[PDB]
Design a protein around this ligand. Structure first.
Ligand SMILES: *C(=O)c1cc2c(OC)cccc2[nH]1
Ligand SMILES: *C(=O)c1cc2c(OC)cccc2[nH]1
Length: 171
């Protein structure tokens, strides 16, 4: 079909089928996260909840990295223009919180220019949003199992430690 290769991200089978540039500009094949439980989240530096999200994501990674937890943080400036800096500045901001998980280059998460990984996560059965599937604000979280399937979505108001009770099921 004609829409079978334009909308081809719709039929991807897992997160592992996508690639994305890391915050240094180097393309990363996300199939490397196979066998790991992943939190995928859109981040911002100037949000009221920036400090609580970064600190708790660092907490989670420190507690469960050896269990197979990985965190993929995608900067995004679409929500209140709260991520206006360059990738290099965002990388340095994250270093101030002692971030050891994976920082990616800034993307869009909504609209036609959204990174296709985010287009795909939003249409997964367990990635459904309230009042539509669009990302509603900074620091939405998706939990991804070891096979790259979306298993849970957490809204911008849910601090990262809320995810903790769900993790042992997927390790
Ligand atoms: C796969 O990416 C895919 C399937 C599909 C269908 O299925 C009927 C309709 C429209 C666009 C589509 N993309
Ligand atoms: C990581 O998955 C993991 C599991 C675990 C257990 O299981 C009882 C005990 C202590 C540390 C651990 N880390």
């Amino acid at each position: 079909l004609e829409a079978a290769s334009r909308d081809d991200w719709r039929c991807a089978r897992s997160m592992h089928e996508f690639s994305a540039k890391d915050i240094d500009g180097h393309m990363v094949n996300l199939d490397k996260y196979r066998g790991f439980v992943c939190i995928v989240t859109n981040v911002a530096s100037q949000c009221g909840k920036t400090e609580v999200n970064y600190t708790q994501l660092v907490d989670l990674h420190a507690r469960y990295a050896e269990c197979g937890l990985r965190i993929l943080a995608f900067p995004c400036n679409q929500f209140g223009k709260q991520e206006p800096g360059s990738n290099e500045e965002i990388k340095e901001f994250a270093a101030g919180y002692n971030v050891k998980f994976d920082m990616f280059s800034k993307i869009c998460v909504n609209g036609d220019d959204a990174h296709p990984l985010w287009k795909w996560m939003k249409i997964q059965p367990k990635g459904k949003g309230i009042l539509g599937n669009a990302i509603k604000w900074n620091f939405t979280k998706f939990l991804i199992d070891k096979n790259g399937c979306v298993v849970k979505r957490y809204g911008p108001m849910e601090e990262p430690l809320v995810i903790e009770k769900d993790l042992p099921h997927y390790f």
